[PDB]
Subunit: 183 residues, 3 copies
Amino acid sequence: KIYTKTGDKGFSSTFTGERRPKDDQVFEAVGTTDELSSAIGFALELVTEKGHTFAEELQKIQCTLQDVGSALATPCSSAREAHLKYTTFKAGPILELEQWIDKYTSQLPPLTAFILPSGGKISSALHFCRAVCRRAERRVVPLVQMGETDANVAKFLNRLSDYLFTLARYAAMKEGNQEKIYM
Amino acid sequence: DDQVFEAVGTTDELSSAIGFALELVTEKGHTFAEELQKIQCTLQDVGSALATKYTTFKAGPILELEQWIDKYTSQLPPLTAFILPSGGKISSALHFCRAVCRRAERRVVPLVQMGETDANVAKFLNRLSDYLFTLARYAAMKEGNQEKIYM
Amino acid sequence: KTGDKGFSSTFTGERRPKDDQVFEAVGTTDELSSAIGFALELVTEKGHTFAEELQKIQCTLQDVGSALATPCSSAREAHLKYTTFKAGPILELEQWIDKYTSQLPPLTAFILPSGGKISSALHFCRAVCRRAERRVVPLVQMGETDANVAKFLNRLSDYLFTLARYAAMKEGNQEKIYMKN
Ligand code: B12
Ligand code: B12
Ligand SMILES: Nc1ncnc2c1ncn2[C@@H]1O[C@H](COP(=O)(O)OP(=O)(O)OP(=O)(O)O)[C@@H](O)[C@H]1O
Ligand SMILES: C[C@H]1O[C@@H](n2cnc3c(N)ncnc32)[C@H](O)[C@@H]1O
Ligand SMILES: C[C@H]1O[C@@H](n2cnc3c(N)ncnc32)[C@H](O)[C@@H]1O
Ligand SMILES: [Mg+2]
Ligand SMILES: [Mg+2]
Ligand SMILES: [Mg+2]
């Protein structure tokens, strides 16, 4: 059977084998990363045409988010206690995001003021993804400040926020949609 | 402070949800589309007021919300029980926006009770949940869609 | 205008600030039900029975909302129908899961949220359901909420995963599969 029922009393396992209540910050961080990945999946379902580079990029990002969830599930202090290795989150994906950000940023008109979330279906979906990503970042920061998670995880999520904002503007520009401003 | 960051992020999440909902209106000329965009602007104001001993936040938008609520209420049949979140694409999206707005209100309340932000922000988010509920009902009615009540 | 001050009431008459755990739990259950509503608005084109199932789940979520709003420490006798959350719905979920499991190919690798609009929407619903479970667990481990509520949410996570897989299979969509590096 797909379920075990071992979590019916409200406890679950980390990747170090330690059992904690399901409201622990480790599970809040893992679950919010999962929620971000799901929002990105639904946004991916909105692309009308085929062969879009940024769709491949978003799928790569989803895989990286699975890796980020795995990292968050192995707290470093319990990995030292459990005799396990370090759980080092590498910087590759961050640099990749920075490259893609430069690519899209070089193509947009300069932006000076606040944007209302808008610009077509894809663009609005990506703005919602951006807000969920920032929530995930806020869930990861306390774990970093405790020494439980590599700081590169928070760096990746922070850079993904900017990637999603820039990609929303890029999609809006390509659709001929103008986004709104003011008060 | 972390609470300020959380409240601001949740108001931003609400505005983004409302934007995606707006993307579901297939016709132009809808007054409530303009109302939702004006609400997005007011949410920008809410976010700047939270990121301040606190910033003043005028109460006019709350009256705007109450007027719109009355306008829509006088067009709807009486409702005495809970309904299932439903009623067409726009109505369902607006129910989800209503849930996110109530989450944002929960994030703003402790800031107000600490005296770190103006109470009008909190009562705006409150009235806003009510506006979103009424507008979801109204959008469902205008499409001829069925209002599901479970007992 | 009641509650403009930041306070609200439980169904037992207790007044608490709106940031209390009970309101976080009830609000997240509401959010889950609304996400299911939107997913249902995508489903109403073809797929039949599982739309009935999703609506039943919404009704059950209204019942769990009633349970969470009636803390056991304050519950009088006339509130006993609300504090007792029966196990029926849980078993129903298991039944439905078994049904869909008999029609799917066996699962070997990790799945990315994908598989068409219905499937992706259900994956998002699953994530919101797990957030709701995390909000309900502190009330249960405090003795304020029937444990069957947490059991129901834990099983609903798996129901939604399996239903996403089923919708993707019926639409002919292949889900995307996790790949290292
Ligand atoms: C609170 C805050 C937010 C809140 C709410 C903001 C709101 N009012 O709706 C939230 C979380 C929503 C937010 C989001 C973003 N913000 Co912000 N935010 C701020 C903060 C702390 C104050 C802004 C504010 O409310 N000012 C008060 C109002 C009245 O001012 P305003 O007249 O509208 O003028 C502002 C803009 O013109 C902005 N501005 C100036 N230069 C630039 C350049 C660019 C490229 C942009 C986009 C804006 C911008 O700064 C002015 C003063 O704040 C500022 C930092 C600061 N400047 O003190 C950052 C700041 C404005 N934000 C910034 C960024 C990057 C963003 C995001 C793109 C981040 C993201 N990845 O999501 C989004 C934008 C999404 C959107 N437009 O909806 C940057 C902008 C410059 C840049 N480096 O690109 C700032 C300056 C922070 C920084 N120093 O890096 N933000
Ligand atoms: C817990 C709670 C919630 C939970 C819901 C839990 C659930 N069971 O689904 C959440 C946070 C989701 C919620 C949402 C809302 N609720 Co509420 N909620 C309550 C509360 C505290 C208890 C309700 C309950 O579980 N009763 C037990 C069940 C078994 O009772 P029931 O047989 O179904 O009977 C109830 C309904 O008929 C309700 N009722 C009576 N008149 C009206 C009118 C409307 C419009 C509605 C929706 C319900 C309603 O009152 C009865 C007794 O509780 C009550 C206040 C109270 N009763 O002390 C407010 C209350 C029922 N809610 C109210 C409101 C306004 C809402 C919202 C519209 C708020 C919003 N803007 O989103 C939504 C509606 C969502 C929907 N209909 O789908 C109002 C209803 C009256 C009114 N002011 O119009 C109440 C009375 C609070 C108040 N005094 O303002 N709520
Ligand atoms: N509600 C939740 N929110 C976030 N993460 C969770 C939640 N529940 C479990 N997890 C994490 O995801 C992993 C898989 O979840 P799963 O639901 O399969 O486990 P469980 O609920 O503890 O067991 P079961 O569901 O079989 O009773 C768990 O090992 C745990 O680390
Ligand atoms: C735009 C402004 O939002 C704040 N900020 C930075 N990261 C987050 C986040 N994850 N959530 C909410 N607010 C954030 C910073 O103060 C920045 O300047
Ligand atoms: C309808 C019922 O919902 C609860 N309630 C009131 N405000 C909120 C909020 N922001 N978030 C969640 N629940 C709330 C109260 O118990 C109210 O009576
Ligand atoms: Mg499992
Ligand atoms: Mg209210
Ligand atoms: Mg589980």
